[PDB]
């Protein structure tokens with residue numbers, strides 16, 4: 577049985593190898609069990625300095641979500657997160673606008689909808705629009721990593737053509753696709 581909560585299933589992975597791109601982080605995820613798990617209920621993380629993977633920086637980065645960490649990871653030079661679950665969206669057009677250091681990829685119903693395939697100091701990208709064909713819980717996953725230094729990850733979403741954006745949080749997230757009452 578998988579726990580039902582108003583959030584995405586979160587996994588954190590650390591490494592002492594360099595993360596340069598999405599492929600490197602996905603390979604890290606493939607290579608071992610998560611260094612920690614957590615509930616991603618308020619996906620607006622950071623900003624901080626001096627490496628996400630060292631000391632208590634992950635806790636600080638995750639903020640309101642850190643109280644759900646399964647363990648306190650040891651130090652690494654590089655690290656990142658893999659989030660997966662469901663997000664309630666009505667049929668219509670949407671676009672992400674993401675602030676991040678380093679890179680990331682977000683997919684909805686298996687299709688990439690926001691990609692930065694490289695390292696970067698903090699930068700905000702307004703991504704191209706996509707459509708949702710049927711109202712309901714949509715499958716969503718995210719990866720984000722830090723190669724070192726500063727770190728931030730805030731992927732906001734607009735349903736109104738970029739006039740207003742919201743953080744993905746417990747209002748609309750579901751870990752399993754069932755309706756959370758938590």
Ligand SMILES: O[C@@H]1CO[C@@H](O)C[C@@H]1O
Pocket residue numbers: 677678695696697698723724725726727
């Ligand atoms: O990863 C970013 C780009 O490289 C360095 O400037 C650190 C910074 O956080």
Ligand SMILES: [Ca+2]
Pocket residue numbers: 605606607608609610
């Ligand atoms: Ca794994």
Ligand SMILES: [Ca+2]
Pocket residue numbers: 630631632633648649650651
């Ligand atoms: Ca630690």
Ligand SMILES: [Ca+2]
Pocket residue numbers: 639640641642643644
């Ligand atoms: Ca909390």
Ligand SMILES: [Ca+2]
Pocket residue numbers: 593594595653654723724
């Ligand atoms: Ca590094």
Ligand SMILES: [Ca+2]
Pocket residue numbers: 677678696722723724725726727
């Ligand atoms: Ca960084």
